[PDB]
Every structure is written in structure tokens, then in C-alpha cells.
Design a protein around this nucleic acid. Structure first.
Ligand SMILES: Nc1ncnc2c1ncn2[C@@H]1O[C@H](COP(=O)(O)OP(=O)(O)O)[C@@H](O)[C@H]1O
Ligand code: ALF
Ligand SMILES: [Mg+2]
Ligand SMILES: [Mg+2]
Length: 613
RNA sequence: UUUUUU
């Protein structure tokens, strides 16, 4: 009440089809193909796999593609394979390794076609989770089943042994609201935690997970929708001194993060287990009988590290990973759950949840749903928000400990009805050893006006902006020269195109300060929700005469972008395009009134008189 | 709408 489901079968019959809409739509939307006139060069790898090389008049490493032969000089043929080489410093040849070496039409070279194959794994796991919820009644407790379905059911009290102290060593001393939040959550089967940015939702989550783990009843499962949110929580949990295993996507095994040392795939390789460490050093070959012992041993190692972990951390979709099947979790916490669709949250939930904690802020980013029809039918509504509408009262945090009061003013008043209070002062937020000259000494922020125009990026739907990129670099140098360390600086931008451009431009050219720049985080705004830096630089990218600003129209995205910094925020963008949207127009006027809308050379900034719509 | 996930 009011939204109710008779049972989990009806529930699946509603969300199952929604997920299918979104899946089918994304597939159609992300799938592209060449003309059927590609010329192929055939070869064999050293390992005797079959390879096709070709040039293209926008693929990425590891992509899956279908190669079709459409000519008449051999039987019609199609084969699946994956990109093992893209155009680079060795040449413009794309190479793909085929799954199956035969019977490829290696005697012909013309009249081929290349289709990019959209990967369906993430939606498969959501469909699969929905089915498990409906068919297997042991996948969640009777209580949680009834609560999730909107049934009336008496409140249940979990009678655990409460800790001596709620606040946990290694983490900040909890304030009264966080203590209340921890103490209360431990005793309920279902809890929602809510609060504006930087109120310690993740700190509080880590403290809860710590106590649930110390109950000694098996590993706690901990998730978030995006890899970066999972990593924040993982690091905080690690600080409590617990044994944490970060389970990563197979496709991310070569991505570098500050919690890489906790990644399951890395822990296994640092194990002894000397034999398996030998078969790994060997596959780094491909022997088929050797792969049998490799796998068995690997399964033995994964089983060991996972079963003995106090906590397992992974994305919501990652929870559906085959390595975790046949595992059950009594206690599950999902951080930044408001950024996920409900079927995405259900992925970890159906692993046997008897106690479930959801953390969120609906004023920050929601899930990505490209199919407007599906979004409007409800796929856009998170589980956290449905439960709020159903009457579950969230536990609230309201006092912020991240940012200088001047950074919190606009977001607090605009997004949170002035209810975001400050737990730190201006004096708590003067960087020691930092000799930077702010336009307004008392306001560590400014919007740096940048004339320019966006370009469409390699991908075809994303944008970049070369002028802003240039200024981002200048500003970064200025900050570094003022005394900021690389790791105290973060650069965020809403677009992937701009993110990638910045990586190449700052980190992989020959720049004099390349080694410094490489220690500087660059990321999309969306990925960075949940993370914080001392100093943030935001590149807005959009800059055009009559093409709009795209998803910059979403207030949630600006909110996240404005609330990542502790000590200072510098915004780089073009007020001309931004001003056309009421929200950005208001942020621009706000900065103008604060005298931090500026122009000119960095060492000699002047207010921008420039007028905008 | 071009972002999250695999
Ligand atoms: N009770 C507290 N005392 C001191 N610092 C705190 C406290 N609670 C949170 N913080 C800090 O403020 C920041 C934001 O916490 P975080 O958990 O990331 O916010 P949120 O999860 O709500 O976005 C961190 O740097 C963190 O250590
Ligand atoms: F709510 Al946050 F970093 F997770 F501000
Ligand atoms: Mg958080
Ligand atoms: Mg460089």
C-alpha cells in the first residue's frame, strides 16, 4: 500500500518486461555496422587461433564483433570474435581473434562486414535476479519478501549483540545522528539511510558493515552501482582493519585503482599455491589439459578467499558474478542505491538477504535509462525511492563534513531546501602550504569563462572541447605550483569524450609535468559520485550556438558536480550555451553576484562583464 | 538523452 504486488511472480511480470524494453532499446541504439565491403587479411596467432586484420574508413579493445562474409566466392559465413588490436602506433589495422578457427573463409578477402556486438550480461543478470526472486523463496527472508512487495507485516526486531562502541577505530568519530543511524540499522531487517552530499553516509555504511562483520556469522555483502562508489566504500571498510575482498569485473582486471591490492584476481596471484602461480605466469601456454587444472585450482582459491573474507565488495551487477553463486549473504548493504534501477539492486538482494540496508540521495544521480518509454513506466524509479513512497521512513543525516561552507551554499539552498548544514567551518578548510590566489580570498571557488566550441568526439555521441581542456591543464599547473599535491586534485567532466581527451592531452603527451599529471584523477561526473578531492576542476564542455546542453539539463548532475570538493572548486565552461538553461543561468548569476565569475589570464583575472541569456 | 554497468 499503495503500490502492492500479489507475489513475486507478478512483480517479475512487471519489471521483467521493463528491463527487456531497456535492453532491446540499448542493443538497437549501441549496435553499428560497416558496409559489406570490408577487406580482410587472414593469419594465425602463435597459439594457432585465427585472426582477421582490417582497416576502417569506432571500435575499442576487447569489443566483441561479428564478422560476416557476404560474397559469393565461398559459402555465406559469420563468426564471432573480439578486438585484440586497434589503430595505434603500429598502424591503422584492426585485428580480431575468432572464437573458432574453422571453418573460416580464409581463401577470400573481399565482401566482409563487421558488426559491433552489444554485450547483454548486465541485463541478463537483472532478468536472472528477477526470476530467482519469483521462483526461489529462500532467496530473501519471508519478512523482506513481504516488505518489498508492499504487504502489511508487523515490524520485526533483530536481537543482535550491540557493540561496545558504535563508532569504529580507523574511521571518524560518528556524530549523534550517525551513531543513531548505526545503532538503529543493526536492529532492523530493512533500513533506508538518506542525506545530502558529504553527510557521512559512506562513513556510516562502513561503520555498519564493520559491526555486521564482527558478529562473526559469515562475510557481509557490500555493493554500489558504479565501480568508483564500490571503491570508496571498500577503502573505508579496509581502514577498520577488516579482511576485505574486492570482486572486480573480468573486463576491469587491468584497471588501476587504490584498492587494486584488495581485488580478488590480484590476491589469488599473490598466493601460495605455487603451482597455480606457475600456470598463471605461463598463461601470461593456453594448454587445454593445463587449463583444466588451472580452473580447478582457481576455483579452490576463489572459494578460499571469498569464504574467509569478512566482507565482499562488488558492484550490484557484479554480485551476479558466477564466482558468487552458491554463496548466501545474511547481511547486505547497498550504497548509492538511488543511482540504480530496482532490478539492478535486486541482483545482490536475492543472494539470501535477511538484513538489508539501502543508502541514498534522490537529489543526486538516478540510473541511466535511455528508453524513455521504459523510464516513464517506472524503470527510472529506484528501489530506495519505491520503499520511501511505500512508507518506510529513512534515517536522515544532515550535517556535512566535506566542504568549505561557501562551496555548500548553492547546493544546500537549491537542491535541499537549506537543510544541508555544515559540520566544518571556513577555518577548517584553509589548505596548509597552499599559496593560491582566489579571485575572492574568502570564497575558494570561481567560474572561469572560456570562449570556444564543442566538437563531437570519436564515439559519435559524446563531446569534447579543446579550449577548456587547455585551460584545465593551465589551472592544474597553477594549483600544483601553489603547493597542491597531484593526489589532492580531481578533474571531472560530464562527457566521456572530454574525459578521454584530457587523459591523452595531459597524461600521455610529452608534457614537462607528465608524471605529476598522471597522479591526477580524471573522471566523468557520473562515475565520481561518492568520491571527493581537496580540489576539483570541472569542465562543462557544452559550447554551441543552437544545439542545447544535453543531459546537463539534469539538476542532479550539477549537484553532484558541485559537491565533490573539500577545499576548492574551479569551473571551466562557456556561459553562452549554459545560460540558456534556468538552472545554469542561476548558478552563473549566483557566481556573478559573488564576484567569482572571471576572465582573462590566470595570473591577472578580471570579472567577466560578458552578458548571457 | 550518451552516461552507468558487463
Ligand atoms: N562524524 C564525522 N566527523 C569527521 N568527519 C566526517 C564525519 N562523517 C563524515 N566525515 C567526513 O566527511 C566526508 C564525507 O563523508 P562521506 O561518507 O563520503 O559522505 P557521503 O557518503 O554522505 O557522500 C569524508 O571526508 C569523511 O571522512
Ligand atoms: F552522497 Al556523497 F559522496 F556519496 F556526497
Ligand atoms: Mg557516499
Ligand atoms: Mg602529456
Amino acid at each position: 500500500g499503495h503500490m502492492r504486488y500479489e507475489d513475486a511472480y507478478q512483480y517479475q511480470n512487471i519489471f521483467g518486461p521493463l528491463v527487456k524494453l531497456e535492453a532491446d532499446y540499448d542493443k538497437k541504439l549501441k549496435e553499428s555496422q560497416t558496409q559489406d565491403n570490408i577487406t580482410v587479411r587472414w593469419d594465425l596467432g602463435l597459439n594457432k587461433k585465427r585472426i582477421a586484420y582490417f582497416t576502417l574508413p569506432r571500435l575499442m579493445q576487447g569489443d566483441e564483433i561479428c564478422l560476416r562474409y557476404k560474397g559469393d566466392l565461398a559459402p555465406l559465413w559469420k563468426g564471432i570474435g573480439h578486438v585484440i588490436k586497434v589503430p595505434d602506433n603500429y598502424g591503422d589495422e584492426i585485428a580480431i581473434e575468432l572464437r573458432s578457427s574453422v571453418g573460416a573463409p580464409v581463401e577470400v578477402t573481399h565482401n566482409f562486414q563487421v558488426d559491433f556486438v552489444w554485450k547483454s550480461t548486465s541485463f541478463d543478470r537483472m532478468q536472472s535476479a528477477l526470476k530467482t526472486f519469483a521462483v526461489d523463496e529462500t532467496s530473501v527472508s519471508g519478512y523482506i519478501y513481504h516488505k518489498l512487495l508492499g504487504h502489511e507485516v508487523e515490524d520485526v526486531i533483530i536481537k543482535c549483540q550491540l557493540p561496545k562502541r558504535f563508532t569504529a577505530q580507523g574511521l571518524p568519530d560518528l556524530n549523534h545522528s550517525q551513531v543513531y543511524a548505526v545503532k538503529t540499522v543493526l536492529q532492523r531487517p530493512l533500513s533506508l539511510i538518506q542525506g545530502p552530499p558529504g553527510t557521512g553516509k559512506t562513513v556510516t555504511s562502513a561503520t555498519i558493515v564493520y559491526h555486521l562483520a564482527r558478529q562473526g556469522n559469515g562475510p557481509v555483502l557490500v555493493c554500489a552501482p558504479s565501480n568508483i562508489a564500490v571503491d570508496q566504500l571498500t577503502e573505508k571498510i579496509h581502514q577498520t582493519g577488516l579482511k576485505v575482498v574486492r570482486l572486480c569485473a573480468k573486463s576491469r582486471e587491468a584497471i588501476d585503482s587504490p584498492v587494486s591490492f584488495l581485488a580478488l584476481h590480484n590476491q589469488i596471484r599473490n598466493m601460495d599455491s605455487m603451482p597455480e602461480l606457475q600456470k598463471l605466469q605461463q598463461l601470461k601456454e593456453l594448454s587445454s589439459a593445463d587449463e583444466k587444472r588451472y580452473r580447478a585450482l582457481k576455483r579452490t582459491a576463489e572459494r578460499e578467499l571469498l569464504m574467509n573474507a569478512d566482507v565482499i565488495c562488488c558492484t550490484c551487477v557484479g554480485a551476479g558474478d558466477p564466482r558468487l553463486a552458491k554463496m548466501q549473504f545474511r547481511s547486505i548493504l547497498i550504497d548509492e542505491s538511488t543511482q540504480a534501477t530496482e532490478p539492478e539492486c535486486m541482483v545482490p538482494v536475492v543472494l539470501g538477504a535477511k538484513q538489508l540496508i539501502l543508502v541514498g540521495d534522490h537529489c543526486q544521480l538516478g540510473p541511466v535509462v535511455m528508453c524513455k518509454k521504459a523510464a516513464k513506466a517506472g524503470l527510472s524509479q529506484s528501489l530506495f525511492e519505491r520503499l520511501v513512497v511505500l512508507g518506510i521512513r529513512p534515517i536522515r543525516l544532515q550535517v556535512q563534513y566535506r566542504m568549505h561552507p561557501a562551496l555548500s551554499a548553492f547546493p544546500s539552498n537549491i537542491f535541499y531546501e537549506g537543510s544541508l548544514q555544515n559540520g566544518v567551518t571556513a577555518a577548517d578548510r584553509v589548505k596548509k602550504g597552499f599559496d593560491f590566489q582566489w579571485p575572492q580570498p574568502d570564497k575558494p571557488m570561481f567560474f572561469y569563462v572560456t570562449q570556444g566550441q564543442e566538437e563531437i568526439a570519436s564515439s559519435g555521441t559524446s563531446y569534447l572541447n579543446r579550449t577548456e581542456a587547455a585551460n584545465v591543464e593551465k589551472i592544474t599547473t597553477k594549483l600544483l605550483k601553489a603547493g597542491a599535491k597531484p593526489d589532492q586534485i580531481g578533474i571531472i567532466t560530464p562527457y566521456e569524450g572530454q574525459r578521454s581527451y584530457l587523459v591523452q592531452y595531459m597524461q600521455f603527451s610529452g608534457s614537462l609535468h607528465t608524471k605529476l599529471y598522471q597522479e591526477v584523477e580524471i573522471a566523468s561526473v557520473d562515475a565520481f559520485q561518492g568520491r571527493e578531492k581537496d580540489f576539483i576542476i570541472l569542465s562543462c564542455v557544452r559550447a554551441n550556438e543552437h544545439q542545447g546542453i544535453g543531459f546537463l539539463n539534469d539538476p542532479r548532475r550539477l549537484n553532484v558536480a558541485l559537491t565533490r570538493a573539500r577545499y576548492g572548486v574551479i569551473i571551466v565552461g562557456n556561459p553562452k550555451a549554459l545560460s540558456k538553461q534556468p538552472l545554469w543561468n542561476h548558478l552563473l548569476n549566483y557566481y556573478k553576484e559573488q564576484k567569482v565569475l572571471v576572465e582573462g589570464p590566470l595570473n591577472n583575472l578580471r570579472e567577466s562583464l560578458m552578458q548571457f541569456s
